[PDB]
Symmetry: C3
DNA sequence: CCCAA
DNA sequence: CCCAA
DNA sequence: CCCAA
């Protein structure tokens, strides 16, 4: 069944921000499996406990983008997420009209690993064929995206996009009103915005934007959208301005507006990908496959010169993930001679850009970690700068690398981790069990603060301490006991 | 004999604009073989008929350059061209002094296919050796070309360049005066300019410019010329200015002048080819030959990224045929997996630039033209764009592709073809025989206009309708009957 | 022993400017072997003769840099150099503290060929690993070099850097005061500057700059130096300014100052090499080794296009030896088909840039030098332009190529060689023996000038004429007779 | 080798 | 094929 | 690996 696949995707595969297909933003130690549909079915049925504050807060995660900009990912509290996933699954025969959208390329699908929503799983050549077919006969292209799409979704517009704005306002129950209520309860009983990273909020964004896609399709516009980014192919410039006007109208019906910084009109024939994609791919040392494994093993000079050229391209242009793409080009074709030099280059670059930190794990097995203690200083310096820069992806990834490889962590950098106080880094330190007393003091300060939302911001740390029998449940409800008795661990071992 | 080779080259190989060696501007359906020496010798002997207007007009052809600029090629009326070719050949012992010019790189030669004049047949490495030898010891280079060379040749300067300006003016018969008269009769009895595309007018341009080459050679200038483009290599900047002054003097003796837009002086060592030639060739996926056919078959990613990089370089520089060179680099090394994707890229690019339309025929055999009817809309959209842009090369090439592959043509674009009214497109539609009535109405309107020059502009269409016995001969002379009786078809089948 | 290796390095390997490891600035006909420590020990013991002028002048050599700038190399007179080398060797247990410097990368070492000091023998990958290790954790890099380092070394600062500035001034014998006196006698009894090219003056520069390296190391600065170029890696911009201030202080203690033109602060991550290094290496046709000799033999088009792209990169940037690196990339991977075309390209480029003249000797064997006399005009034109530009490296290299390949030299270019009057070109003409009378007139004019320094500027020519018994010794001392009796030839045959 | 002029 | 949105 | 400084 496909409805059951929705349930398993919502809880076990796309509860955490696992939407990135190439490499996960969150380290693989955190996971959402062994959280079955039956367990959320029990949690939604549970009525015990009482909370002074309406709604729930979420575990916060600040991931660096290509330009070192923070992106706010959220892990929803399992009570609110269990109710939301239950209500989404129980009415998928009313919701699955977002599956049959030809203008939304990123949408729920029945994938092999189980995830409904994977960003950029379709790969650039299937994108290339479609972009070539769409761009034919048109001489202008429009790139326009919503300004704050996920962060300013108005939750009460969820009923509107289901049944029309006017009919929903006149009717002021239906399933989408309850979906509105549950999506509000997911984030502090707040109507504006949705959490970023779970697939329930991406489903909500698909539900809202599918009405705009429908009313743009009915006017004969040939357009594609990737989440919030609309690309349009127009024969004339006036049709481009008319598409922009109609898109602004239909988004303004749902309290949404265009990002006019990124909204631009270019003259076809433009590059199908970005410019730096083609510049890196013509200069790539692995752009030709020789079908024998010895011939495509790159020497040290080739990889080093490609990485320096990529650094120059990223510094000169700065309009995309040049370094990310470039290191992912040449990281699997190394031989054992240049593993250490490329690892040193990646260590320097991953210090200078935290987004390149997750790559080290694919080269961390071949490099001898002990060596002359130098890599311990490497990782501690990266940890310290990650604490100063208040980034979560690099910080958690570096802690994962230190713990998984039995690499010692200094006390001063533990103190600045405490001062940073991001939830998932503290969950990793809790899993280390060395710093149990300092984690105890931190969660104790959260407890005597007496704020429900501050406990909700660290529910994952509190539940991980509860699962190893090191802390009582801060909540008076039985959701944590239901999760523990039925075996839910968010840091599972093999 | 070399004189006989001249006559066969003039009639069967270089009557049509066939000077491009890589790919013909005119589709292969139009041809000038089965127009033997004997038929031209008969037509020159014919004295029947009468014409109210002196001279003849020519079939007009508008070919897009690299920057989408129209270039006017002309197909001379076979009476005038037959007389002109006979007069050129019968005195080749007086004319062949243009063969022994070391400064004219493009000139008549005894080629394998039969053509006397092929532009850029020597290839860039034989050009490289000569350019390296010429550039040595000189630190300045001059690039200067005639402003409107073929379009502003004075016909009366043809006797001058044979016997001196002053001697010919004092003498005011000689063979060059009759060559003047015949070159005038080729284009409406007009002294100014020559038709572009036949080799008789290129022979005339060689005759005129060889005197300038002689009086530039006598002063010791080391220079080369490609038709009208003069390159010069000077040790000093003042020798460059003196070469420019002497070239201006000797061209002004023949009512000719330099294009000072393209006249520029650069500092050696400059590159032998253009810049984008070098950037395309260092980034080319086929720049190394592995001597086995499986290893140099390019994958889809390599060709797609090279074409995208070529599009970026053509947009950024815009100083040459970047896209033409780039697709000719990688079009023969494809495998069957990327054939359809490259065809889609070529279809989009050939819509955006008509000069890339002739390439499609090398990939039109492998691609299934029926498919899901999409390629018919591709070709019809390209046809409508070609009719809007008033280009003849892409429009006739697309007609050739539609007719040769049994691809249907919509009626609206047929009406827009007739509105355009190019001669060779109407010849192709005549060859299709579906649109016989509309072509009949068009040539009937031309007939009731009662203008000799308007019939001469479409003589090829009129003769093709006469050859299939669908229209009477508009001319009262017997040249068309001589051509029909002895078997001249300008759309011959194999 | 390592002290003996110092002696053999000082006399037989690094007396001449042989510090460049890739290709020697001086042609290999000039050499300093068969000049053993015994002969220099004899010359230092010799007390015969008398000189009116204190000190000695040195043979002058003007080598073009990458930007065609003249660099002044000097060949020290063998009396002064023998005394200086003996005094350097006899106290190496006091001097070898420059060997144990971790901040000086170019320093004396026990090399395989025998040289103590080779510029950039470490190769760019060993530099890459060290640069990656140093660049970690730092976000600013400082590049600062001494303004006139070798040309404005104060000789009296040689004692200071040995024993402290204040102690040496208070003491105003010690071995470093005698090293001061001998380094003064090496160049005209002048305190400012040292000759460039011998290793004794590089030893002196290491001695002076090691105190600055020590007092920069004691402050904890992580820095490297290549002769006079200091690179520093600072976490903060303030520490970068503090490093610049302290470097200025410690250099000003020794009458030295930074070149603020080349002193700059860049933001890490910057490229390990220069930019054009990476651009040339991603576009290099030989960047992949296929481990079979037939597959990496480059075709003509690849080398021609790479050289054209390199010419464009050198013209566009002009910040390094783009052409030197580029031709050294692809000169050993040629096959016999493109040898002549690449040799012609090198002939044109080596005319336009004399630095590329030494490369011709690696392709001069395969190219037939007789041919149609054209290469004789090539070499004579290059000789003439080398005479006009007053450059010594290309001029002497071209004389070496003409003499070694039995290529005739015209009389007019011999006359402008005479007018230029560089010493090593005249030594090569002396070795040719054709122009013995003109060399005799030139040295006779030097003799009747009656200036000791003007004889010292051509001591190499005078000694080479003495060794073939064609001229008497201009000096009244017995150093030349000691050198002749023990078999010292600076133009030795195999 | 593969363009243009 | 290998990014992002 | 292949330059410079
Ligand atoms: N790992 C994930 C999971 C989900 N999303 C969602 C949230 C974003 O709203 C949407 C794409 O929108 P943008 O990245 O363009 O971001 P915004 O719309 O918030 O802002 P802006 O237009 O200013 O960039 O993708 C994401 O970015 N990253
Ligand atoms: N297929 C052909 C056959 C012949 N020619 C001739 C006619 C041109 O006059 C000549 C070369 O001249 P240019 O292309 O430089 O063009 P013009 O001299 O007419 O103009 P301009 O200098 O403005 O470009 O080559 C051509 O261009 N194309
Ligand atoms: N063949 C050789 C042998 C030795 N050196 C030395 C002398 C130079 O002083 C030193 C490097 O310093 P710079 O080339 O930077 O030269 P300067 O310090 O004299 O000048 P500037 O900073 O203006 O370039 O290397 C050299 O350049 N070439
Ligand atoms: Mn957005
Ligand atoms: Mn977006
Ligand atoms: Mn012209
Ligand atoms: Mn310096
Ligand atoms: Mn021209
Ligand atoms: Mn320097």
């Amino acid at each position: 069944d496909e409805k059951r696949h929705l349930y398993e995707a919502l809880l076990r595969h796309n509860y955490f921000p696992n939407q990135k297909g190439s490499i996960s933003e969150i380290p693989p130690c955190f996971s959402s499996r062994t959280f079955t549909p039956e367990i959320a079915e029990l949690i939604s049925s549970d009525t015990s406990g009482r909370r002074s504050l309406q709604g729930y807060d979420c575990v916060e995660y600040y991931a660096t983008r290509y330009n070192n900009f923070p992106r706010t990912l959220s892990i929803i509290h399992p009570k609110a997420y269990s109710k939301l996933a239950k209500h989404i699954h129980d009415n998928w025969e009313e919701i699955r009209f977002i599956k049959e959208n030809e203008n939304s390329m990123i949408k729920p699908d029945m994938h092999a690993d189980g995830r409904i929503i994977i960003m950029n799983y379709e790969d650039a050549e299937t994108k290339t064929i479609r972009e070539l077919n769409d761009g034919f006969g048109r001489r202008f292209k429009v790139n326009a995206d919503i300004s704050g799409c996920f962060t300013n979704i108005y939750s009460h517009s969820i009923p509107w996009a289901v049944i029309g704005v006017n009919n929903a306002k006149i009717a002021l129950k239906h399933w989408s009103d309850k979906l509105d209520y549950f999506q509000r309860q997911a984030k502090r009983n707040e109507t504006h915005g949705v959490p970023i990273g779970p697939a329930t909020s991406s489903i909500v964004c698909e539900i809202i934007l599918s009405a705009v896609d429908k009313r743009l399709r009915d006017d004969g516009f040939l357009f594609r959208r990737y989440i919030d980014d609309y690309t349009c192919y127009c024969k004339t410039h006036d049709d481009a301005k008319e598409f922009l006007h109609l898109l602004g109208m239909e988004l303004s019906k749902y309290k949404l507006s265009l990002n006019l910084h990124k909204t631009k009109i270019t003259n076809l024939p433009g590059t199908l990908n970005d410019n730096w994609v083609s510049l890196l791919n013509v200069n790539s040392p692995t752009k030709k496959r020789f079908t024998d494994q010895d011939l495509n093993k790159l020497s040290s000079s080739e990889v080093i010169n490609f990485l320096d050229y990529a650094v120059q391209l990223n510094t000169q242009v700065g309009g995309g993930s040049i370094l990310k793409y470039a290191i992912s080009l040449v990281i699997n074709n190394l031989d054992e001679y240049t593993i250490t030099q490329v690892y040193d280059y990646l260590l320097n670059l991953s210090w200078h850009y935290p987004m390149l930190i997750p790559y080290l794990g694919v080269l961390i097995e071949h490099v001898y970690l002990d060596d002359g203690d130098e890599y311990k200083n490497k990782f501690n310096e990266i940890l310290s700068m990650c604490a100063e820069n208040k980034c979560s992806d690099g910080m958690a990834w570096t802690l994962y690398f230190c713990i998984k490889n039995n690499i010692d962590i200094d006390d001063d950098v533990i103190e600045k981790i405490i001062c940073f106080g991001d939830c998932l880094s503290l969950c990793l330190l809790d899993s280390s069990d060395i710093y149990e007393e300092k984690i105890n003091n931190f969660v104790s300060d959260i407890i005597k603060l007496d704020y429900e939302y501050d406990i909700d911001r660290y529910w994952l740390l509190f539940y991980q301490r509860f699962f190893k029998d090191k802390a009582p449940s801060p909540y008076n409800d039985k959701c944590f006991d239901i999760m523990k008795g039925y075996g839910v661990d968010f840091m599972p071992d093999e």
